[PDB]
Every structure is written in C-alpha cells, then in structure tokens.
Amino acid sequence: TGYDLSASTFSPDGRVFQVEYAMKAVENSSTAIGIRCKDGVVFGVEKLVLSKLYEEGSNKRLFNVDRHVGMAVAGLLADARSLADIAREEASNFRSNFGYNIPLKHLADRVAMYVHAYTLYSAVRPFGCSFMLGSYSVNDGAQLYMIDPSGVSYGYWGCAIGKARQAAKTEIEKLQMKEMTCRDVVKEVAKIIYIVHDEVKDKAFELELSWVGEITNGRHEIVPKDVREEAEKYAKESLK
Amino acid sequence: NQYDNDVTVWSPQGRIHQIEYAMEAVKQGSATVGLKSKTHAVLVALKRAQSELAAHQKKILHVDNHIGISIAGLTADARLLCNFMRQECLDSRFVFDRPLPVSRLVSLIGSKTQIPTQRYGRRPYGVGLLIAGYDDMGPHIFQTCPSANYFDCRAMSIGARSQSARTYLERHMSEFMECNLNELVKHGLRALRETLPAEQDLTTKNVSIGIVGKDLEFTIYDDDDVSPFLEGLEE
Amino acid sequence: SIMSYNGGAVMAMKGKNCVAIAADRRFGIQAQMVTTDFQKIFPMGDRLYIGLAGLATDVQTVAQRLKFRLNLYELKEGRQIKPYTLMSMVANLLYEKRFGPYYTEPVIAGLDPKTFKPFICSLDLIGCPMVTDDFVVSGTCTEQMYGMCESLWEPNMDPEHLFETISQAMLNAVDRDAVSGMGVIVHIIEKDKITTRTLKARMD
Amino acid sequence: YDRGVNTFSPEGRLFQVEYAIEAIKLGSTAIGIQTSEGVCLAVEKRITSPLMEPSSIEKIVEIDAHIGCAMSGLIADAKTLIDKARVETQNHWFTYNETMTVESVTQAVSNLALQFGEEDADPGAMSRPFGVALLFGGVDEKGPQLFHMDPSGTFVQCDARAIGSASEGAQSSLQEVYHKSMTLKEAIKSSLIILKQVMEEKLNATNIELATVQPGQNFHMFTKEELEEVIKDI
Amino acid sequence: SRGSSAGFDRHITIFSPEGRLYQVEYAFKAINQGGLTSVAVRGKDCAVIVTQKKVPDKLLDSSTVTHLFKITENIGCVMTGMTADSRSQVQRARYEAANWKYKYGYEIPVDMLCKRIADISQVYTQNAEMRPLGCCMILIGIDEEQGPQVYKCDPAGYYCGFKATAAGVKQTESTSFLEKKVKKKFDWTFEQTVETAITCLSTVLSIDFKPSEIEVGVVTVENPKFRILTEAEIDAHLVALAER
Amino acid sequence: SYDRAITVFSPDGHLFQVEYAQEAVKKGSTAVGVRGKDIVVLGVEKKSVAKLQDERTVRKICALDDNVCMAFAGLTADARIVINRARVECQSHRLTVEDPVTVEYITRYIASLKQRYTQSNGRRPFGISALIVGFDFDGTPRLYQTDPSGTYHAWKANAIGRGAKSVREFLEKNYTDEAIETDDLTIKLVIKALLEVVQSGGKNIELAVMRRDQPLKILNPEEIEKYVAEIE
Amino acid sequence: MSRRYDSRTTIFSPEGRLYQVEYAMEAIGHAGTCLGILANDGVLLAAERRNIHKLLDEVFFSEKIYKLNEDMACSVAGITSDANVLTNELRLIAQRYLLQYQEPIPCEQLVTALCDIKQAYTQFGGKRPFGVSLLYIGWDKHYGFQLYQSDPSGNYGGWKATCIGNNSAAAVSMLKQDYKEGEMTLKSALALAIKVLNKTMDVSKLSAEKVEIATLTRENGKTVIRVLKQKEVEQLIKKHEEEEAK
Amino acid sequence: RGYSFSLTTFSPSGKLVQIEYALAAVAGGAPSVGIKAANGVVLATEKKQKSILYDERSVHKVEPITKHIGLVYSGMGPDYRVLVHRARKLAQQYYLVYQEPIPTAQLVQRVASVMQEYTQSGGVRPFGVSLLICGWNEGRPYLFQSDPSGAYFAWKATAMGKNYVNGKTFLEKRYNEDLELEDAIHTAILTLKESFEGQMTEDNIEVGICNEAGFRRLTPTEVKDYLAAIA
C-alpha cells in the first residue's frame, strides 16, 4: 500500500518492488540466448513479427556496441536503443581515453552501473531491458556477460533471457559446449531456439544469429547468408 | 489507481500506464498511410475539418528536400518534433554537405522521445509519425510512437481506425514494388476511405499528399494538385 | 604608482599603556588640492581606531566595509572586538581581492579590551598581517616616516610624550612630501579617555 | 491535487488543456468574419455596472497595421500573447523588412501554448496553459485572412468563427448567414444581428465595439460617432 | 507508540512517533534477501574471509561469480547483500580509495575507507529523494601500524570493527559459535584461523563444505597483498577438518 | 529551486487560487472613490483603531508618483510588494520617457505583475485589489481598479473591500451630473457613501483629495468632522 | 519531485486565509508574553520568560530581547529557533542601509525591509513560514520614537501600547483603558506595564526572574538601550505591590 | 535535483510535528550526562555493546571538534557524524578568518543554525541528535545543549537518553557550586549507575573532560582509575 509506488522505497520485507516490476517487463519479452565455445561466442534471438507490414530486419535486437563487442537485448526495445547508444559512448570513451579495444569485463561494468543508477532515485524509473554482452579476443577468449534491470552481471557458458529461460537453460546443459567449434555451435544454437519456441500466443519470428570468434578475426558480425541458411536448415532437419 | 498518474511508475505487470495513455492520443486523431515502391515513397494524410466553415489542419509538413512527415497526434506537439527534425536535416547539410540518411534521422527521434519517457515530471510526446524519405539505400517508410520505439516498414497506417487501413495494405503488398508514380498514390487513397464511414468521401479539400522519389524532391500537393490523382479512382 | 594619486599619510606609534594614531587632512588629485577636511582615521569603537592611506577611493570603500563587518561581529558576539582579531579581518578583507586588490595600506591601533594591552599593526595591498612592538606607517611618504619614528620612539612612554613624539613625527615627515600636508589630525587612546587634537601645520 | 499538469487522461488528452477549453465558455462573445475585401471583428464588452467607463475596455487590439485581433475567456492571460504577438510581428519587419503574414503570427503565439510544464524548465516557464482563445484578422498578399487559436496550440484557418460565452448559439446562426462574396457592410450588419441577440444587455454605441481592416486601408476601429450610424441601420 | 506510524514515515525516511526510521530498518532485511552468509575472522597475523559460494546451475561461470572483490592491492572486500547494490559501492569504494591516493598520496587505511563509505550512506538516510543501499560491506586488510583490520558497514551508516564478523542469512547463530572459540583464546596462525573459520560455517549449516562450495580470501603480515585461495589450496585446509 | 504548479484549472474551469485570492479582498477595509471635475477623492474606513494605533503608518491610501495615487483593500502584506514594484516602474518610465507616467501606464504594469504570478511555477496569487487614481496630462481625472486576477478597468465611482456591494448601491443612485460640481459636494458624496458601512461611527473615516497639479492631500479628523456636521 | 509528499504551504484556504500563517500565530499564541508602551520619554519592552530552572546558566543577554542596531532593538514571541534566522537578517539589512546611505536606518525602513523576507516565504518557494512575530523599538531623525509589531504574515503597524504572545488579548484591553495619549511618562509607563502583567501572569507574585524589562531612551544625541537588572526590576515590583494596599 | 519542498510544517495545534518526534529519538538513545562545575566540564556517555567481538578502539562516541571544544551525543548515531564533520569545518572557517579558536557560544550558534537549515530547506529531515558541546574560553567553561529544533540552551548539569527525567532529578539533589572537576567525574558516573544496568567497566563507559588543558578523551586505563569510586 504505497510502498511500491517509487524506486526509493523498501517494502516491509526489504524488497524494492519498482525494480522487481521492471524485471517482469523482461519476463514478457521474447526469448534470446547466447553461448560460448572454444572458438568464440554465438548469439541468437527470437525477433517476433507483429505484422507482415514490417520490413525484414526491422526492430533489430542485435546491436553492435564496438567492433569486437556484440549485444543482444530482451525487454522494452525503447530503453534498449538508449543502452546500445550509451554502451557505444563507453566503448568510444575507452577508445579515446585508453586507445585500444575495451575489454568485455570492463564494458559490462560501466553499463551495469548506469542501469543501476536509475533504481536509486524517485525521479527516474528502472530500465525494463535485460541484455547480454559477448565478445572474443585472442588474449582473452570467449566471454559472455548478462546484465539485468537491477544491474547484476554474471558470466555464463550459456544463458536464456526473456520469456523462456528455465526451458532454454535446461536444453543448453545437455550439450557440452567447451570443446566444440563455433561452426558446429551455430547449428546447435538454431536447434535450441526452435525447440524452445512454441507457437500459441505469438505467430512468426525471424531467426537472428551472430559471429564473434576465431572465424571473424575478432570483429563481431551477423551470420552471413550461406552459413545462416546452412545453419537454419540443419535445425529444421533435426526438428523431427 | 495509484499507478496511473505518473510516467516513471511501473505496474505489477511491468506496464507503464502513462506511455500507454500517450498511445491513445494517436488513436484520437485522423488516420494517415504511406508506402514505398522501389523508387517513390508517398505519404497520404487525411486533413480533418473542425467544421464545414473552418478550414483543415495541416497533417503533412516539410522536413528536408528528400524527407517529409505525416503527423497524427497533438498538432502543436508535433511542431516540436518537426522543428527538431528540420534542425537535424539542416545540420547534416551544413556539416557533411549531404542529405541526411532517413535511418539516422529516425534514430535521433528515438533519442529525443526517449528522455521524457524516462524522467519524472515530464510527459511523452503524444505524436505518432510516418517519415518518408529517399537516400542511397532507397526509399524508406518509418513509423514512430510515443513510446519512442521506431520501426522500419513497407507500409503502415496510424491514427483513428487505422487497423482496417493496415489490413488493406497487406493484401496488395506484393504489388507495391512495381507501381509507378500514379498507381502508388492510388493504393494509399484507397486505404483512407476504408478508415472513414461510407457517409463521407474523399475530396480535394480534406486530403493532402506528399511524394518523394529517385529524381523527385519531396513536394506537398494541396488541393488543385490533388484532383488529378483523385480522378480515375472508383469509390 | 596608483597609490600616489591622492597621496596621504598614516602613522601609529605604541606607548606603554596607550597608543596614538595620526594622519594628515589633505585631499587632492595629483598636483591639485581640493579640500582639507578629508578623514583618514575612522573609529572602530571605544579605544580602537584604524587608519587608511593610498587611493582615496579605497580609503572610504574599505572603511565602509569594516564598519559593515565590525557591527555584524559586535552584534553576534557579546563582547567588543579585540584589536588582534580586527587585524585578521582586514587581512581577510584585502586578501579576497588578491587579483583585483584595493589600493590602501591599513594601519590598526588600539587597546586590548581585556585590561591595558596595547596593539598596533600594518598591512599591505594583499593584506599580510604585520605586528610590531614599536610603530607602523603607511603612505607615499612612508620613507620619511621611518627615519622620524626610528629616532624618536622609545620602549615605554606616557600619553603626554606619545603626542609630542607623533606630532613632530608627522609634521616634519609631511613637510618633505609634496602630495601630503594641509594639517594633521592626531588621536590619543588611553585607558581612561581619548584625546583628539588637530594640529596647526603649514598650508602648502 | 494528485495529477500533474502533463498527465494524460486515459482518453489520451491532457487534463490542463482539457480544462482550459472549459474556461473559454465563461468569456465574452467575439465574432470574426472574413471577406474578400476585408475582415470584420465584433465583441461584447460586458459592462458590469453603470459607474464603469466603457472606453477603458478594449477587447479588440491591433497586433500590427495589417493585422487585428480579438479575445475571449480570461482577459488577463490575453495580454501575455498580445504583447508577444506584437514583438514577433516587429521582429519580422525588422529582420526581413516586410509585414509578417497572419499565418506566421499564429505560428508564433501557438508555439507558446504547449510550453507549460513543471520540471526541467526555466523561471520563465508557465505552470498552466493559457485560458484565452484568440482570433487574428488581417490582410496580406494572400488577401484577407482570419484564424482561430485555442489553448491546445492548434491554429486553424477559418472564414468566420464565434468564441466566448455562447459559441454554439452564434456558430449555429453564423454559418447560415455567411455566404461567399458577401461584402463588409453586409457582414457588419449580419455580425451585429447575430451579436445583438446572443448578448443580454441591449445594443448601444458604447455597449459593444467593432473593428475592420481593408487591403488598401490600415486596421480601423469605428468610433462612437460612426457606430451610432451603424446601429441605426440594424 | 511501539510501532505506531504517522503519515509518510514508512515510505520515505522521516521520524515516526517512536523516533525510528522504518526505511533503514527494511534495508537490514535487504541483506537477508541475498540468500547466503559470510564470515571474516581476524587472527593474530592474518584476517581470513570465508564466503558461502552458491552456483546452482552448471551453465553459470564460477570464475565470474565472486563476492570477494579487490578494493586496492592491500585491502580486501566481501559484499553480503543485494548483488546490484554490492557492485555499486565497490565501484564507489574504488573511486574513494583512488581519490584518497590522488589527494593524500598514500594508500587509504581500512578504517578510513569504511568511514567515507558509511558517511555516504548517511546522505541517503536524510535526503527523502532516494533510498539507502541494501548491501552490507565487510572489509579486511592490514595497516602497517595496527596490524590486521576487519571492519563492517551497515546501510544505516554505522561502521564498527569486529574481531570476528558474520553477515547474511545466518548471523546471530553464526556469532554464537564465534563467541565459543574466541573466548577460549587459541593461538591463531594462518592454518589455525582458516580451520576455525571454515568450521564456524559448517557447524551452523551442517555441510562440511566441498572445495568448490567456498572461496577464501586471505591477508597476512608476510603476504600484505590480498589473495584468493585456489581450489587446491582450499582442499589442503579441508582435510584438517577430518582431524580435530 | 522549487518549480511546481500552484494555480491550476478545475473541472469547472475556475481557478481556485485566483478565486480564493479574491476572497481575501472580500474581507478588506472598505475603500471608495469618486471622480469630480478638477478634483478626485479617495476614502477608506478603518474599524481596527483602538486609539492605541499610530494612524500614519497604517494608512492604506498611498502615492505611486506625483501625478498618481492609489488605495487598496485586501491583505496588506501583499500590497507593500505591488506598491514597491509599481514605484520602481514609475521612475524607470521617466528614465525611459522624459515625460511623466500616464495613469494608464502604471495600471498596466500593476496588472502584468498579477498575471505573471498567476501562471508562474511555484507562486501564489496576490490577495489585493488596488484602486489607482491620478491626473493624466491635460488635467483629466482618472480612476482605475485592479483585480487579483490581473484585470484592470476604469470607473467614475467605485468601491472595493468589505461591504463594497452596499456602497455601490448608494453610489449608483446618487452619482449624477448635477453632483460633483463643487469640491465640497464631491467630498460630501464620499462621506455619504460610507454611511452604509458606518457602524454608528465615522470618526475613523480617512479621506484624500487631488486637484490639478497639486499633490495628494489627506484631511485630518478635524477637517472631515466639519463635513460630517452637515447632514440634515 | 513526488508531489504526494508536498503539503502545499503557499496555497490559500477556501476562505482565503493562508493556513501556515494562521497556525504560526497559534505557535506565537503560546509563546512568551511581550508588551511595549510608548511614553513621552522612552519606550519599554517587558518580556516574560518561559524557560526557568535552577540549572539554567543565563550566560548571554536578556534572553529573547535582542539588539538589531545601535538605535533599535527587538523582542521575540514565537518559535525560539526561527528567531535567530530573522535576527541575523535584520542585522544584515540595517548594515546594508548604513553601507550605502551612511546614516542610521529609520524604523519604518527596517521593518518594511524584513517583511519583504516574510513575504517571499509565504508567497513562494514552498518552504514553511517563520513562526516568529516581533516587537520593534527605536528612534530616528524624523518621526521620533517608534513601536512596531510585525507578524508571521509580514503585517506590521505603529502602536502606542501593544502586547504579543500568551494572553496578548487580555493585556491590550487593559492598556486601552489605562494608557493616556501624551500623558504617559517612562516613570508612569513602567508602573503601568507591571500592573498589566501581574494580572496576565500565569504564575502569581511576579518574580524578578520571570518578567524582564528593556527600555530605550535617547540622551545626548545617542540612543541608550538598557536592560533593567533584576535589582531594579524587583524594586519597581515592590513599589507597585505597596500601591495595591497602601 | 531533489525535493525543494519543506518536510516540516506547522500542525493545527501550532507545534512542529517533525521536531517533536526528533526529540523522541534522543530520549531512547545512549544515556549521556554532562556537568559544568568549577574549572572544567565533564561528559560521560554509556557505550553499551551487544557482544565481546566489538572492538572498542574503533568507535568512540565522545569526539573533539577542536582542541578547546568537545562533543557527545544522545540520539541517532550516524547523524552525529554529519554535524561533527560540519562543526569541524565551522571551527576552521572561523579560525581562518579571525585567526583564533572559535568560542563555544559562537560555535553552538552556527551549529544550531545548521540544524535550523534542515527544519526549513526542502527534502531533508531534521537531525536525530541532541548535542552537548563542552568548551573552555577566556577562563570560563561552557556547557551548551543543542537539540534538533536548533534552540540551544546553557546548562549547569543535564542528562539525556534513557531516564533523562530521572537523570536531572538526581543532578539537582547532588550538583552544587565549589564542585571540583574531580567530584564532577564522580557525580557524572554515579548518575549513569542509576541509569545503566549491570557492571560498568572501562569499555562500558566513555568519559571526557574539557578544561584549561584542552579537551581530551580519557583512555580506558584512566577511566578504570575513576571506576574505583575514588575520584
């Protein structure tokens, strides 16, 4: 009764509700996953098509924060486009200040701090956007960090953000991704999503994937046509 | 009832009510449509009459030579965005001396309309937009919202009873690419009539259009220039 | 320099239980006199005075700020100001102006309100506090007033001898200064009373 | 009281703007009319007592030589716009060395209608929208023009309008009697015939005021001596 | 009064009829929501932190999940509380620790780092605009004068150095065991302290922790730099629990 | 700073703060005035006189300039402000325009202040209704009235404050052209006007007059008593 | 900004009277009773003391009677906290006047300068008003002796004899009967103020510790502000106590 | 930015509601007694912990503001660190301008004026701390009490915290003049024994004195010397 009206109030049990409510904004968002392998990091996203009128590629949820850093968002996309633009300001301030590629562990900190500064006050609202950041480097290796509305950052071998999580987080555990190669991972990522995706409420989507790793020489890219077609067909053949 | 009055207050369901109520402001005003071929991109806006004696509001505004918008929402509130868009398109020709990419111009609106949704004590802009433009990557039709989320669309319809106009655009989608100047406009004109009841028809007074294409700059046809396109279309 | 525009002279010499402060009466612009009624010595309250020299604008400008800050200090505190505390006030007043300094060299003289304790001091454009057990001078004629005060001053003097000493100190030092003159006003601060005398000096 | 100034109602309209238009209904009746040869403006003074001097109440102000005005609702709020409109007209004459058209004048005052707000503002920002509705008559190279403004900031071109205490009663009978090419002298009579019935106190020379503007003649307000001949032809 | 509320006292931070502050009371409950516990024991020459480390899912990377941070080379930290608020103060503690060395030109002492942190949590208490943070910091380290130092910072702004600490879900019960061993006053060495500290958690939780179920930060006079004991070094101390 | 909307609209369109401000005027000290030929008269009644008060410092009839005076009825704390703000504008006008201040020019500026404080963020509307009087160049008397809302009018005769309704009922009947012919009957009309608000009293009535280029003149209790002596 | 927590201190009431101003006057209504009397020579201020205990030091000054300027003083009835803010403002106002004009500030000019500060807090800013209503005494080169009483709303005025604080209504009714215009002298004024208080004191016997008198006279071109010591105060009481019977 | 509106407003009865409850916080704080007698002012606060693991040398209630001034508190603990950090600056800002140590009367005047600023300026609550400021200036001791309202007094002897009513009553019957600083420390600790329950060691009680020697906090070994009930 009034304790949940602002982010500046604790419940009598200690929970901050306005932060817990911003997390439910992600629970209703579409599912996106990410995975590490020996060679690099792979992304996947379920981008729902709300109408045929929308151009293919619109509402792209995979943002490029830096050349070597990818990003995948699940939540309200209005706030996401603000984060992706602010995450670029941190990567560019790093490039300006320290003059080299921003390490992913540090980029997932500054950003997770900015997400946190909006849970303290009563003059702002918490972000409703949960997002993960993968990257690869020859001197670092496959790195994947998830950030949530509260600003908590964890590393993962694989993760599921958005609506379906416990369903997708169980399907990733079965396969052993440590010794596998990225070219064989892409085929498994699409295999997981179609298994996770079930059509009851929503209708159709567009599978989006990303390369970062040894194949791309560190530059984060979307999966090229032939490989994306090569990977998507395998998940359809393995569907049954 | 307590969650309604503020923009920065979430709900138990993770829904911001004021941003939802700002979406209702788009449904409170005249419907507009637009679509693009491989070349041209044409906006068609229905100018609403307060009465038969009073004239019609202007629903289409110039932005840059290659870019134009159709405002549906609070009228004087859309002139805040239009003044912002005109300054961004002039700063692009003043600095880079090149026409501003339409995918960039819509991204600056996503940054401008995002701040009032974030901060307390401010309201989200209650204006939806269709930005028609032409650049090196081809014509574009972009929808925006009060929620600051902008799309990339082949054809859309916003405003009162826009769902019916959206349904029409889906069926003919495959033909939109090969249409010439005249036939393309006729697709949008057929969309407006679906939004309004049969007791009202399209006239030279209440319908304004704009056209941007490969070799043609964005231009607004007011009244007498609308008649040649109106003629030749059965209702 | 700039402090030589209006000229002026201020002197203070400490006695045993008493102090004496003196200044000339001349107000003029460079080579031209205007009036002989100008006042370079201002009351800070009972048994405490302050002299001011240098540019005549800042003499009246700095003084009006002290009576501004003094009356605030004396109303807040339940006691009168100590002459030592007043030195640090005028030092802080002039130092805040460090980059646009007032042109003046305050000269403070008075008695510690405790019992008998005399105090004097002088300052600079920047307001470096300088405490002396003998005398302080400021003005364009300062060079003159050093030699006069050196020979005449003694460690302990009764009020009668302060006046005779500071009178001949100013009168002779000013006669050799072109921009100062036109009579001298001498104040005497005792424990019992205060004696003010305006000397008859050469008009020139 | 629980609902900021910028809060949207569930119907998609700002409260304070929704309430501002409710304050126009309490104003004084003002009737503009457009004609190819000029614009006529008439408004009721609403004299509240015999001791009041009618000459001091001016509800029709001259924005510029080529542009008139009218006001209804709160008269206090009108002075902020009128003094702003006069500056913008002179700013244009000063910069571009030409008379600002009636179109650009409304875009100047209409931009200030939604400037109201609380947070992230200056000391010059307003806490409420204007409670005044203006009608700008004027003549430019495009001919005589008449516009309407409400607190929402929407300027609308119009052939004629009625605002103030009764808009409905006047707008009902005004659209009828206004036909096409009808000239000024005919419009003035039709303006008073509508206005005389919609008011309460009887029509007098000093009870109401009247204004007009022509393409070849500057904005002119009829004096009492000229109005006594006009009310004679009613 | 005894719990009576007047007006808005329970929403923002202002005095109630009984004089308390309910928002700060609830910040103490935000610590127990973390679902864990932590203990920092101060020996003679050493100060040891033993943290319960929960990795429920195998997909979770163990290397990136730690409650043991490094504020500065010689000062360790363990954050018990809201994970979001934890990394908020740590990033702020590192700024205050580096700003200390940019002004005062020497590495900040542990006692004065808890003071500048607890004084910032005082700002959030008075100002009604914002809430206090819900994390409880425990710093260890060794000052070249007073030796080993173990301090604790509550969200209220009240910091006090303890001989042996506890935090999280189990505290009062975890302290009840610490009252037993500290009163006996055993000779405390690097191996004697870690064996007792790990036993303290095992007595409360009835587990007998595995090597991967904890992480142990340690600092000694011989080893002033803050170090985290590897799984191999942890298991070397776990076999001692088979003994005494 | 503190920026928040105090004055706001209502479902009925009424401004509460502006209407409640006028409620402060609705209990004032009654102030009246009339216009003669060459003369103009102001008056006010004071019921608060215990004989312990100093009548000079409580005078509610002030002077903005040589050619203009004014009165007020309402909360006296707010009048000091408007008056001290109006007197600054009178002198800044003579600095901008070498001519003196027109009676109308200073009445606008008083109204433009009562406007800005209605729409400004985190302010309060004034609770005073000021009645301004003066002679414009060529020597024509002028009488104005302001409103807490910022609306200024003109009047031949007027009354403000408590009991202003009953006073107007006397003024409207007895104000004619055959009246206000002489300076005495113009003053005798004001004293008769205050008879409606007389408590069985009137030794407390204050008056002021202005004639041609002569400055404001306040009648003492003795001069007024001679005017009271003639009734029947 | 969270309006919910905003109490709206500057808004009018439905009857057009500011709440925080009326509630401030009830805070002043229970405060220490102060009064003043203007005589032919000199003006006095009699302040009652509501804090009395064996452990109180009485270190400073008259305790609720201040000194604004060399020529002026004031008493205080209201919140003791907020009075120290006003006094520090009045002492700046008189010294800014003296800075420009190099003459003592007249009583009319100083009072109306402070009431502008009491307006800014009641009109705008949202902050609470001042709970302090003041009495003023002093002399100036023009209108002579002056006695002014302000309030938390900034409404002041001249007075020959006034009272403020607890039982201020019952005291004024006594002054109106006894006070004679032009016939009062400082010797007859002191005897008057005691008779007024002794009836309005909640504690009888009128101890010299409770009521303390401060008088202001002008002598040798200098304003003399004296606080009567407890010796002379008790002497005036005993002279008044013998006049009740003998 | 923040809240610009004052959180303290006058009640219908005419009494500030915030401050009234701020005085209810100091009533339940740590018992604090102080005495102004003869040449010194003693301040004795009872520091009562919940455990033997609490290190005493880390936290001290009695704190010096400067060499000649000292300070204790009864009330909210953290709020006390805000005044001290403000009071230590005001003593320095004074010492920079006037080049002399700040007199207690002028410090309590400026500190209590800061405690008034939070009873007006918006978006802040008043402090929950009722100060006792001991000082020695011009050979005259100073014992003042500042409360959350900002209204400072001058006391010979006073008591705070739990049973402050029972504390002052014990002071009247004991306190007198010609009372040495020695007997003051004795009479101060005797008052806490009626307040505090249980054995009182050097860790339980924290005492400090202010005199011509300056303000110093007594070390636990010295406090143990007075726990013998001698001196």
Author numbering:
A (entry chain D): 6 to 245
B (entry chain C): 4 to 238
C (entry chain H): 2 to 205
D (entry chain B): 8 to 241
E (entry chain E): 2 to 245
F (entry chain A): 2 to 233
G (entry chain G): 1 to 246
H (entry chain F): 4 to 234
Question: Could you give the paper's own sentences about this structure?
Answer:
Proteasome activity is fine-tuned as a result of the association of the proteolytic CP with diverse proteasomal activators (PAs), including PA700, PA28, and PA200, that can induce the opening of the CP gate into the central proteolytic cavity, allowing substrates to be degraded. In contrast, PA28 (also called 11S or REG in most organisms, and PA26 in Trypanosoma brucei, TbPA26) stimulates the degradation of peptides in an ATP/ubiquitin-independent manner. However, lymphoid cells and cells exposed to cytokines such as IFN-γ alternatively express three homologous subunits (β1i/LMP2, β2i/MECL-1, and β5i/LMP7), replacing the constitutive ones, in the 20S immunoproteasome (iCP) particles—with this alternative expression resulting in a change in the proteolytic activities. We determine the uncharacterized cryo-EM structures of free bovine iCP and the single- and double-capped PA28αβ-iCP and PA28αβ-iCP-PA28αβ to resolutions of 3.3, 4.1, and 4.2 Å, respectively.
Our MS analysis also showed that the abundance of immune-β subunits, indicated by peptide-spectrum-matches value, is obviously higher (>70%) than that of standard-β subunits, suggesting that iCP is the main proteasome CP purified from bovine spleen, while cCP is rather less populated. For the free iCP, dominant portion of the map showed local resolution levels better than 3.0 Å, revealing sidechain densities for most of the amino acids. Note that the unambiguous assignment of amino-acid sidechains here enabled us to confirm that the isolated bovine spleen 20S proteasome was indeed mostly immunoproteasome, for instance, for these distinct regions between iCP and cCP, overall iCP model fits into our cryo-EM map better, only rare locations imply the partial contribution from the signal of cCP in addition to the dominant signal from iCP. Our free iCP map showed a closed-gate configuration with ordered and well-resolved N termini of the α2, α3, α4, and to a lesser extent α5 subunits showing extended conformations covering the gate region; while the N termini of the remaining α6, α7, and α1 subunits were observed to point away from the pore and to approximately align with the central axis of the iCP, thus not participating in blocking the iCP pore. For instance, relative to cCP, in iCP the C-terminal tail of β1i and a linker region (Gly133-Leu139) both showed conformational rearrangement, the C-terminal loop of β2i exhibited a slight outward displacement, and the β5i H3 displayed an observable outward shift. Furthermore, for bovine proteasome, the patterns of surface property in the catalytic pockets of β1i were observed to be different from those of β1, with this difference mainly resulting from the difference between β1-Thr31 and β1i-Phe31.
